């Protein structure tokens, strides 16, 4: 049972008629289908042609603007181009692929039209009403190529459009749902529209099959537009292509990995608080490997003795960790007070505050960014 809103261009075709329909959809959805588009056939022919014609230029290179041709695993090739209106920007890699150019111009007029509708639909500011126009925009044309498993990603633009509603999965709002509508184009909204909706609209990540020769066009206002759009694009491209990111943005990449490590230890701390309190209800402090399975269950991942010791790095007085007579690590809450607990009554706030400054210390430093919290060394 299709649960994706479908906009039929045969019925409603005009902007005054379309605008309320779009707005009604965007209040509950981030994804919708487009039925009976005029150039759907031309579009499907061009996509068909790509199987034998106009192959990805493998000698083109893939630069720091995340454009060009990029060989991926399992004989899949990525081709990508980014265009921006702003003369101050240097995205000069021109698309020489005649099929992709033809596909682009059809997806462009279409995408731009519905992009303006989306902004007028759920964004209040009048300054942002004209941000995207025929004279102000940024596009990302992406092509996957298969010689003959899913990639999750969260688009960051206003609107991203697929010329073929196939081999794509979405989350309806708990589990991914496949989309197979060969006569439809697929539309999905990005994080920019949601943020600018100030609550009205929310979006969600997509899954695509990289082996299914998927093409897509994403629309932005000019990348220099302040909400730092470029920062979100960069972070998204880095998440998508970590190997390229290692080459051109190794610091940005390492910082991103560190952020996950911070999220890890913070959640680990609160989970440790819960587990230790429940156990303390019964003299002798509990051994750590006894508590680990329960800790792992709440963390929904494998947690070893080394992970617990990461907390002591962030805050050495958080727990009393010692070796018992049986040479096992015992852990318990501190009995006595220090300067910290005499002036800050919250243990969680104490930790999270000291975790943020530790993180800030690492990224401020003039040293190679470590991507994890080192484990604290306990003496014997």
Numbering used by the authors: 12 to 159, 186 to 210, 217 to 270, 277 to 331, 335 to 432
Q: What do the authors say?
A:
The process of eukaryotic DNA replication begins during G1 phase with the loading of the minichromosome maintenance (MCM) heterohexamer comprising Mcm2–7 subunits into head-to-head double hexamers with double-stranded DNA passing through the length of a long central channel. This topological loading requires the Origin Recognition Complex (ORC), Cdc6 and Cdt1 proteins. In budding yeast, Cdt1 forms a stable complex with MCM before loading. We propose that Cdt1 stabilizes a conformation of the MCM ring in which the Mcm2–5 gate is held open to allow duplex DNA passage required for helicase loading. To understand Cdt1–MCM at an atomic level, we determined crystal structures of two non-overlapping fragments of S. cerevisiae Cdt1 spanning amino acid residues 1–438 and 495–604.
The structure of Cdt1(1–438) was refined using two independent crystal forms to resolutions of 2.7 and 2.1 Å. The fragment comprises a pair of well-defined domains corresponding to the N domain (residues 14–298) and the M domain (residues 299–430). The relative orientation between the domains is preserved in all four crystallographically independent copies of the protein chain observed in the crystal structures, indicating a rigid linkage between the domains. Perusal of the Dali structure comparison server revealed a striking similarity between the Cdt1 N domain and Fe(II)/α-ketoglutarate-dependent dioxygenase superfamily of enzymes, such as AlkB and other DNA/RNA dealkylators, and the Jumonji C histone demethylase21. However, the key His and Asp residues involved in chelation of the Fe(II) ion co-factor in the active sites of these enzymes are not conserved in the Cdt1 N domain. Moreover, an α-helical hairpin (α6/α7), which extends the dioxygenase fold, occludes the degenerate active site of the N domain. These observations indicate that the dioxygenase structural fold was repurposed for a non-catalytic function. By docking the crystal structure of NM Cdt1 into the Cdt1 density, an MCM interaction can be modelled, whereby the middle domain of Mcm2 is sandwiched between the A-domain and AAA+ domain of Mcm2 and extends to contact the A-domain of Mcm6, following the outer perimeter of the MCM N-terminal domain. Conversely, the N domain of Cdt1 projects away from the MCM ring and does not appear to be involved in any contact with the helicase motor. The N domain of the yeast protein plays an important role in MCM loading, but makes little or no contact with MCM in our structure.
